[PDB]
UniProtKB/Swiss-Prot annotation, chain A:
Present with 1660 molecules/cell in log phase SD medium. This is Trafficking protein particle complex II-specific subunit 65. Specific subunit of the TRAPP II complex, a highly conserved vesicle tethering complex that functions in the late Golgi as a guanine nucleotide exchanger (GEF) for the Golgi YPT1 GTPase. TRS65 plays a role in the YPT GEF activity of TRAPP II in concert with the two other TRAPP II-specific subunits TRS120 and TRS130. Involved in cell wall (1-->6)-beta-glucan synthesis. It comes from Saccharomyces cerevisiae (strain ATCC 204508 / S288c). The gene is TRS65. It comes from the Eukaryota. It is found in: Cytoplasm; Golgi apparatus, cis-Golgi network. The chain holds residues 212 to 559 of 560 of the full protein. Part of the multisubunit TRAPP (transport protein particle) II complex composed of BET3, BET5, TRS20, TRS23, TRS31, TRS33, TRS65, TRS120 and TRS130. Interacts directly with TRS120 and TRS130.
From Swiss-Prot, chain B:
Part of the multisubunit TRAPP (transport protein particle) II complex composed of BET3, BET5, TRS20, TRS23, TRS31, TRS33, TRS65, TRS120 and TRS130. Interacts directly with TRS65. Belongs to the TRS120 family. The gene is TRS120. It comes from Saccharomyces cerevisiae (strain ATCC 204508 / S288c) (Baker's yeast). The chain holds residues 998 to 1289 of 1289 of the full protein. This is Trafficking protein particle complex II-specific subunit 120. Present with 259 molecules/cell in log phase SD medium. It is found in: Golgi apparatus, cis-Golgi network. It comes from the Eukaryota. Specific subunit of the TRAPP II complex, a highly conserved vesicle tethering complex that functions in the late Golgi as a guanine nucleotide exchanger (GEF) for the Golgi YPT1 GTPase. TRS120 plays a role in the YPT GEF activity of TRAPP II in concert with the two other TRAPP II-specific subunits TRS65 and TRS130.
Swiss-Prot record, chain C:
GO terms for biological process: cytoplasm to vacuole targeting by the Cvt pathway; early endosome to Golgi transport; intra-Golgi vesicle-mediated transport; macroautophagy; retrograde transport, endosome to Golgi. The chain holds residues 803 to 1084 of 1102 of the full protein. Present with 432 molecules/cell in log phase SD medium. Keywords: Autophagy, Golgi apparatus, Transport. It is found in: Golgi apparatus. This is Trafficking protein particle complex II-specific subunit 130.
Amino acid sequence: LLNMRLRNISLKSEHCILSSLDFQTSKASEQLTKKFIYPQEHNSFLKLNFQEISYKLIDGTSQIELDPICPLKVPLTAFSYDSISATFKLVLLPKSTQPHRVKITLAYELELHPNLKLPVRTSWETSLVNSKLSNVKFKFINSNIKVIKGEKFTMRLQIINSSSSPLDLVVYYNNTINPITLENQYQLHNKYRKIAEGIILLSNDYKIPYFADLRFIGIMSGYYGTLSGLKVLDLNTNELIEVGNGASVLI
Amino acid sequence: PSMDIIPLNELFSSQVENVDWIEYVMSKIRAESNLHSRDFILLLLDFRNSWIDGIKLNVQFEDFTSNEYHVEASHTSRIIVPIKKIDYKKYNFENTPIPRIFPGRQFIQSGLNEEQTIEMRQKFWCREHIISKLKCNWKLTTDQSVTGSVDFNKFIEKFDHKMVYTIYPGRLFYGVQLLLDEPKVKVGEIINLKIITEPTSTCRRKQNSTVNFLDIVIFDSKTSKILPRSNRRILYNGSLTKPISTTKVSEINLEIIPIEKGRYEFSVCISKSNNQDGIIQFDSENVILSVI
Amino acid sequence: ELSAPDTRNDYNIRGDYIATTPALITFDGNESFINCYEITANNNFDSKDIFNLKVRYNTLKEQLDCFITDAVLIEGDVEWFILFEKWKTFWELEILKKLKYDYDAFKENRIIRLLKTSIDLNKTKSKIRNLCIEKAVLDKILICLNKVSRGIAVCNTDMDEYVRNLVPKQLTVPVQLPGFEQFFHVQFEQMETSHDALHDTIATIGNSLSYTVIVENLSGQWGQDVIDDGGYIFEILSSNEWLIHGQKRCAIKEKRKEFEVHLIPLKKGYLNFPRVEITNIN
């Protein structure tokens, strides 16, 4: 009851859940010690946090922070430190423990000594393109973020199919404007315009035959996150697989 | 088998001077300051052999000569050719294409209206322009003396509405450029702007509504245009509706003073009335400035 | 127009809108008319002066009524010699009940009347001594204006020096804040995802209350989100405030606050009170 603490956990896409703990001197404790300190004419407190650490599991391992941290001391403040946990594909929820050491130094070198230790579970409170029909999956083997200029470049698809008939699909980019509140109308027009002529495929209408190298050239500068022009058509039972993957900046 | 025509808007600064069209188009842009960018259109046509041996397939335009490609046996290889636009006011595209004979009556009650005839004349005479300069002069790699030419007349089939927009700007409704004084202006300064407007020969199509409404939109160079409250942004006198008229060389000159940042692009929009969904032309001249 | 008071500082209002070439506006609350003024601060701090404006205007009803009078029934001076110079006030009393359609007058039409009465107006003109040399013109003009539409051209040609412009005014006292601050921070982003190429905003805004605080929002990122945790070091210059954040994260919500209105305040150091918090993440 001197510094209220909370922990926030987020799930990054790079298979590393990041959990950040936040500490803040609570206002009720602030006024509680503040009137008794201002009786002796003190305006700013001094809670010296000298040893803050987090532990892992039933065997105690000290996972470090993401940056440096000295031994600080301040009043009426808040500070947050972020550790990087490991992403779990199973349903084993990791339970961690944190500990601090607040030295509540009253003045003229007459200090008290306080320590605290919480322990709880680091929950989070709740791409590979796959089709809807068959076993056919898509994933770009080369790193989906890429930094290019407006020059010629290459990109690499990959197909994991049912081995019964691996062939009979075609790719094409469809360089035409999709046929569409004037402000939202023109915003959707600018999205559909810079999609339809931003990059151009240097081999479209292209029969596939488990790799498939397909080659572009990029014209217009900008970050094309989930570049969604190219559209792999499946010949038999005529439907379309969108490929919402890959993101190329062109600067 | 197929063909498509796409324009370009980036300037293509150098060290990308290895790709065959880029040096020619940037050479024409580089000197001759009236020979500007933003109006070049690339045509994308795909050569595909049905043979057993490789070919070389050099493409000659009226002055553009491409590199030496290599199509092996059954593949496509999209050879990208630059071409400028064709000016509507300099030319005439509303005359009937002639027949060869003068003998037959040819069912002289022709079953066509006015506007269907005129769009048929446009669709024919645009490919009449783009065929009468295009060539190719091929050779086999393993035989080297079997060099022949090709035609294009039995290959290009027809156009659609997208090709006649992209090749011919006379199909559009207005012709606009922009004039800006200083593209590197400091923030405490107000700069006059200019929007020239020059209507088309498709102004005959409506003939009744003698006003159209030039909207103004503003977008951060990245994405996601700014709502017209324009705080932290361009501080602007007047309002962005600015009525213009048919058959007029009007100039809706405005003023613009920045607040925070640099990367701004300016463009227009034509909407034919003031209500929703009256829109006709999403005009896209889209010039840029900076504020340090 | 805009006018500067008698205190007479170096206020440089570069903004001054003159609608010389257009005699046109509309205020039907569909689009948004914004006027703006690029003023300057004084030679020192100056927080309470008085500004008064000058809007000339008209209303569009008597704009189209002036157009209809000057080019529908009194175009030439031949009819203006006799047929309307003896019944001008009667023409105004007839014109005041015209009630032209101002709902389709902003969409491809101008000077177009609504469905108002035109039957008993002929009987009302016939009741007085109105001669047929004017009763033909005053009926034919209303019959023409019952279904006609003009354009934006030849509107200023009727509006030119034929309208009393009510040059109204207002009062704008150029309101000010209370607690001046001057801070500058610096960041160093420990990258979770490599860089998301964020777009920046160096704010300048002051909080004006008592027992209050200054709350800041981080920069805006537009690539792959939820990441790029930015570390920071304060160097909170020229004051002694209270800080309430350390080594935040540039995702969905960070809100790196700074409790300001507690101790070590100052006066109005400028036109308003300021806090020119310029972060610099290099």
